[PDB]
Design a protein around this nucleic acid. Sequence first.
DNA 1: CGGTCGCCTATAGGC
DNA 2: CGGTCGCCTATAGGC
Lengths: 115, 116
Amino acid sequence: APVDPECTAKVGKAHVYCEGNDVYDVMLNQTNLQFNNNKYYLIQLLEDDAQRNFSVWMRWGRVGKMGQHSLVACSGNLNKAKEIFQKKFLDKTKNNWEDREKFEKVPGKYDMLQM
Amino acid sequence: APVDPECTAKVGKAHVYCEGNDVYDVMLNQTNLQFNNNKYYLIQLLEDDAQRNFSVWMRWGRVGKMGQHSLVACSGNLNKAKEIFQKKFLDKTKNNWEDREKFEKVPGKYDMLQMD
DNA sequence: CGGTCGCCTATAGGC
DNA sequence: CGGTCGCCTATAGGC
């Protein structure tokens, strides 16, 4: 549910977008001790409290460290933000956002934690 | 479920292909008295009795008259015949073959008459 | 593969 | 559209 604290520009001024049972916040993990992988990938779709104004927030890196990030603004174009979000999730999990109740991790890609 | 009599080349030598609940024989109708439409379109996928050899049979025209037709042969390629068949049905009904239990006629397109 | 970019191909649609 | 065509573009995916 919460805006990711590291999103300094929007924590306070915004909330994670929801609609029914869809909630656009996800945390991905890939751990593989053989090749030295202990990394996260976080994605959020953010509506401002101020107006109907949108943005997608992505942050990634080694567990522990605060990593690097990307904020992508979408003005009032909810459809765009949803695409960007869904597409990113897909690139990193090889599952669709829509089929996440039946999530199945794939070798070589990130796994998902439930919220 | 019969080979269409007008298919002279294959009536006697062949039968309508079936596969589970799928039976590849369909009759389409478009009647619209306002624009003067009283036309059928018949499609059949035919397996020979002789061997595993395939063909799609299409006949169409004004109700009453025997119209024109097209026989398309597919040798042993069942998959091809099924595509040709399904694709034609789609062009003329704007429904998929797969979803025909829940068929919904579309304005401007053919309707499907449900067999026996 | 964190980011991002961009051929080629195979279709699907407009005309 | 009842048959057939074939350009050109826009689009989506694989690599």
